[PDB]
Amino acid sequence: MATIKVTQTKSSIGRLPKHKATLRGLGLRKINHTVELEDTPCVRGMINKVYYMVKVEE
Amino acid sequence: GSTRNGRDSESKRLGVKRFGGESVLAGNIIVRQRGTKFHAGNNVGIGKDHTLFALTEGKVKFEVKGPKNRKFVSIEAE
Amino acid sequence: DKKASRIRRATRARRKIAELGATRLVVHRTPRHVYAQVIAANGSEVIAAASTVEKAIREQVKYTGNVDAAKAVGKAVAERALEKGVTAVAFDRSGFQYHGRVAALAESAREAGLKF
Amino acid sequence: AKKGVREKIRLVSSAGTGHFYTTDKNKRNMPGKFEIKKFDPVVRQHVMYKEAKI
Amino acid sequence: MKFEAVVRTELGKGASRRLRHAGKFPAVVYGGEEAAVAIVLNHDDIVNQMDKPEFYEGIVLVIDGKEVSVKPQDVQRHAFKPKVEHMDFIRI
Amino acid sequence: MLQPKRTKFRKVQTGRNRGLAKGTDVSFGEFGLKAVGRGRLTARQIEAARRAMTRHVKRQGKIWIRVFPDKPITEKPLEVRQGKGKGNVEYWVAQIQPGKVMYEMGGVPEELAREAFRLAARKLPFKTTFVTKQV
RNA sequence: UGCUUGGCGACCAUAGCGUUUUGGACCCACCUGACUUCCAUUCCGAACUCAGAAGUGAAACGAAAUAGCGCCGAUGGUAGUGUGGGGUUUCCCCAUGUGAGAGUAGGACAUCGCCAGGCAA
RNA sequence: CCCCGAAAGCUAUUUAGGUAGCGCCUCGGACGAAUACUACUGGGGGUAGAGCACUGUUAAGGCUAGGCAACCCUUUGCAAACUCCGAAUACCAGUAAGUACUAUCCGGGAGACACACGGCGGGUGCUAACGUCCGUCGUGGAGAGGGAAACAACCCAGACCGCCAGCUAAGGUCCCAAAUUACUACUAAGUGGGAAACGAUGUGGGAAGGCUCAGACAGAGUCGGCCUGCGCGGAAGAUG
RNA sequence: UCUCCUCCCAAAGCGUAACGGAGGAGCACGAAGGUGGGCUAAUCACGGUUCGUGAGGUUAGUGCAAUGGCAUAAGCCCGC
RNA sequence: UCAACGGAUAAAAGGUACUCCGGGGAUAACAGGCUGAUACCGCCCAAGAGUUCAUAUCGACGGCGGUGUUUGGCACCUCG
């Protein structure tokens, strides 16, 4: 319900195509870029998809 | 020094064309099959090649029914 | 098993009638007695029903196993279904040949105004 | 290779419309001229049709 | 024979495997009316006694402080190593 | 040398040999020879090991061969270029995974079994272990 | 109000078979008769069919009982596997997610609707 | 100079190093979320696995028709073209949030239709090849920078330009060469810094066992297995 | 070898290559099509100079490959 | 049976060491490269042979490596 912050920590070069789409869907654009997003099962699911290259702050 | 083999037919693009829950118009082919791998249930016709197609508009429903536990495609009114 | 054989002979029509979604007039026939039910399309609920085990038909007829009885039952079930607003039925022989009592019942149910 | 021996024939309307169906026959199984009722579209009626060549 | 048993909090492949790396092994106790209990046993302890016949006749498992008489019901052994991967104990 | 008396199909795609064995328990005898390694056991390899064992036991006790070579293996002939169809069946193999009890022995002393099995083990292309019937 | 039977269904083995027992009030079944011929036999009234009702529940059928056989079936583990890492890379492991098949404990001798009949309320 | 940016595929071809339509690029126009990602819901699976109920194939024993042994029974395996079963994923569809100029349609212009390696699933091959043929994802192609001595295709990471600023990735921190100290172990082999079966009182750890002050082992310990870490031999090539 | 069909390879939607693994087709049928009615296999056991009864349950059948189907048969017989 | 099956013509076989041109290291022959089935060398087990006795010498049935070293595989370099 409340907004979480999500940073991209690793590159999106070479990532599976769907994983790149997911980053686009979180609104992440470059390394160290942080987005604030409403915490949602949907937003959480995207994060789970790209956990290896995304740090969450709650 | 040769192969007696070499041959194969063209793939016949069989299979489920509209899955569970899909909205179909009357006439829409649902399944293309060889024999009745799926049987025709309510609001579903069966062609000469055992093509199942929607007799009415609605939603495709698969269902196991009957004493043999056979799969049936029906169109549900929705 | 005679009953199974008969039920085998019945299935094709009964399945068809179900597919057509028609109101069905099912006829059972036993050496003594004869029966007629009008059943909804669902095949679960009976709309109208006549037989020689029923007191009113049993009294009005001589033997229950006769072709004369089958004419009574045909007439009864038809009248009772027409009361229920059942017009146009599909006739389920139930595996008996369309003949003798079964056809007699059918004819009487046609004469009374059931359309088939 | 071709193993087909069934002779093609033209069935012709017994009305003088000249409408013909085509088909084939095994000439051994059917030596005589084939005859069969078929809908003639010109006279819009089912009439007898009889075999003829081609 | 009496063995200490600890009730498993974490279950499944990743946990089961970690136990086995730690010299313990997942096991389950079931039978009677009580629900099946998932327990950890010490491998060396159990395996050392599995040569004795009495082991197969009956042992006591101290689970959650409570002594429970159980017979060995099933053993899953390693493919080729002399190890035990899992045991089923049926309450006696 | 063992091979199927007949087969549905003369040639078989290579495939893979992943997994652990199914028949991993001494089910007929008292002692068995179990595979620790993975590999193909040829029919020749199987018979070499069987002869080794049998000679040693000296017509005492029973031996169970629990592996059957039923996978035909083809080789291209020498001085043939790639192509013109799959090669000819040269030999049969049995796919061995870790755990597979390949042979079993009974009605002998355990020490004689261990020796018989060590001798057979030396004819085989992967590692093995002596195993006993268990409760 | 039951308790039964008959018809038509739902459902399609936790429902099934097998075995045992039980039932004729009705019903159901077997049954009786069929040059006289409605109808029937690629021969036969077996079946189909018709006219019947003396007999009998023998068979069948229904019901009950029976885990005997099938069926169902956890928990736990195991296999595999999506993603990301690692390796000793013909094959594996680790983190996380998912998670069988087999087997075990056990379950189970169905549940339900409409109509009609008999008995009994 | 600025912006975008492929393909080495499919189908057909007297075609195979050509060409055509399609796929992929671009430009204009129309259209506007119909698209992608995720959660949830609904689907169909017959793959991995597994299993032996079928079809085959396999072992032992029983029972026995037959003439040793069917067929059955019990036990036990195997399967690309077996299945009583059966995932993960993927795909199809719906619902919904957030993010995104997405999707689609009609026109102008192409280019390409020799692909490569790497991962994963496979066929072929010897589970050989910097081999070959597919599927799928990545990179190269058309991609600089850092690492991997040097090294298209691996790891990290996408270069608008300038800066004698700072933080980090992979990878590193004795000297070449930018950057590390402390502590705890193990290894003695320059193992590290090529190579297996197998061999061996090398050595470290763990959990048991046998035998022993009624005397073990060759007057106090001793013997042998198991689970494990690290080492040794096995180990021969041509300019240095 | 060249077109077509079936299976496998093919990675549980579709599709997917090799001078990869296996087979088929280049027709047949005026009924072997339509429909109404009817019917239900294989193989054994046992008794009889094909017949009867039982078991069994489709292991049969399908004009012709394989695959998927098929008892309400799509299999088998007959009338029109 | 336009079956070369999207079907160049209605109508078509060969030779060239007498040869020619345009190309290709897209593609063979030499040598290099990769690979190591094969080969060669080594080793493991030890059936046995060896009067007796596995191991003086030899080493069946099988197994594991090394070399690049035979026979091969591939088509990476080179056909201005």
Largest sheet of chain A: 3 strands, antiparallel
Main structural class of chain F: alpha+beta
Helix content percent band of chain A: 25-40%
Helix/strand/pairing category of chain A = alpha+beta
Helix content of chain F: 10-25%
Give the helix tally of chain F. Answer: 2
Biggest sheet of chain F: strands side by side, in what order? 3-6-1-7
| Strand line-up of the largest beta sheet of chain A | 2-1-3
For the largest interface, the chains and their residue counts are: E-F, 4 and 11 residues
Note the beta-strand portion of chain A: 25-35%
Q: What is the H-and-E element order of chain F?
A: EEHEEEEHE
Please tell me how large the radius of gyration of chain F is: 17 Å
Q: Give the beta-strand count of chain A.
A: 3
- The span between the termini of chain A is 12 Å
Report the C-alpha radius of gyration of chain A, rounded: 10 Å
Major beta sheet summary of chain F? 4 strands, antiparallel
Q: What is the N-to-C succession of helices and strands of chain A?
A: EHEHE
How many helices of chain A? The count is: 2
β-sheet strand percentage of chain F: 25-35%
> Which assembly state applies to the chains in this document?
part of a larger assembly
Assign an overall shape of chain F. Answer: elongated
Give an overview in words.
This is part of a larger assembly, with chains A (58 residues), B (78 residues), C (116 residues), D (54 residues), E (92 residues) and F (135 residues). Chain A is α+β, with helices and mostly antiparallel strands and 58 residues long. Chain A is built from two helices and three strands. Chain B has 78 residues and is an all-beta fold. Chain B is 0% helix and 40% strand. In chain B, strands 1-3-6-5 form a four-stranded antiparallel sheet, with no helix packed on it. In chain B, a hairpin with a 4-residue loop joins strand 7 and strand 8. The longest helix of chain C has 19 residues. The termini of chain C are far apart. In chain C, helix 3 packs parallel to helix 4. Chain C has a four-stranded mixed sheet with strand order 3-2-1-4, sandwiched between helices. Chain F has 135 residues and is an alpha+beta fold. Classes of the chains: A alpha+beta (58), B mainly beta (78), C alpha+beta (116), D mainly beta (54), E alpha/beta (92), F alpha+beta (135). Chains E and F meet through loops of E and loops of F.
Give the helices and strands, then pairings.
This is part of a larger assembly, with chains A (58 residues), B (78 residues), C (116 residues), D (54 residues), E (92 residues) and F (135 residues).
Chain C: H1 2-20, E1 24-29, E2 34-39, E3 46-51, H2 55-60, H3 67-83, E4 90-92, H4 100-112
Parallel strand pairs in C: 1-4
Antiparallel strand pairs in C: 1-2, 2-3
Helix pairs in contact in C: 3-4
Chain D: E1 7-13, E2 20-25, E3 35-40, E4 45-52
Antiparallel strand pairs in D: 1-2, 1-4, 3-4
Chain F: E1 31-35, E2 39-42, H1 43-57, E3 62-65, E4 71-75, E5 88-96, E6 101-106, H2 110-121, E7 128-132
Antiparallel strand pairs in F: 1-6, 1-7, 2-5, 3-6, 4-5
Helix pairs in contact in F: 1-2
The structure holds 4 RNA strands.
PDB class: ribosome
Keywords: Vibrio natriegens, Ribosome, Bac5, Bactenecin 5, 50S, V. natriegens
Entry title: Cryo-EM structure of the Vibrio natrigens 50S ribosomal subunit in complex with the proline-rich antimicrobial peptide Bac5(1-17).
